[PDB]
Design a protein around this ligand. Structure first.
Ligand SMILES: CC(C)[C@H](Nc1ncnc2[nH]ccc12)C1=[SH]CCC1
Length: 166
């Protein structure tokens, strides 16, 4: 968990302008969080980038999990292997607000982080799911109580988050 170059926002939330895949390769954290969907189909965004970096081993494992357990609920999670990127991957489903899913489920999504002492994570629901990224960071800060290191792969968005926060 050798995180470097983060800015501490609160007692337990840190943030960096970085690709989460590059962070995972350098740090080999105990847990990396995936911004997943309910069927664990890693087609784009953070999910597609993490899966590509495992050479599709994450997708093969996810398909087997879904066959045996069924889909996750919105706001839910499962713990699977982190493959070459981390000890574990915590797959978390935030609401797709562009498709009418309730934004209050973003609090339930972030609550899953509290089962792990230290996590490398992305900003939930901030991609194609359509939540305001600054609102997602506010819910993270007011929900997560364990130590989370947020990687945001966009310098313009990073600067807007840090200006709004501090
Ligand atoms: C908001 C956006 C810049 C961010 N993308 C990323 N954040 C961190 N590492 C990344 N690697 C590849 C994409 C990527 C997302 S997509 C879904 C949730 C958060």
């Amino acid at each position: 968990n050798s995180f470097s170059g983060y800015l501490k926002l609160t007692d337990n939330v840190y943030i960096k302008n970085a690709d989460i895949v590059e962070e995972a390769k350098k740090v080999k954290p105990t847990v990396v969080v995936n911004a997943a969907n309910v069927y664990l189909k890693h087609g784009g965004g953070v999910a597609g980038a993490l899966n590509k970096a495992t050479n599709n081993a994450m997708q093969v494992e996810s398909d087997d999990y879904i066959a045996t357990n069924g889909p996750l609920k919105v706001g839910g999670s499962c713990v699977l292997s982190g493959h070459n990127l981390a000890k574990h991957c915590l797959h978390v489903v935030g609401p797709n607000v562009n498709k009418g899913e309730d934004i209050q489920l973003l609090k339930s999504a972030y609550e899953n982080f509290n089962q792990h002492e230290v996590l490398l994570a992305p900003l939930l629901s901030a991609g194609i799911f359509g939540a305001d990224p600054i609102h997602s960071l506010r819910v993270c800060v007011d929900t997560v109580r364990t130590n989370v290191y947020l990687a945001v792969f966009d310098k313009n968005l990073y600067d807007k988050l840090v200006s709004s926060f501090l």
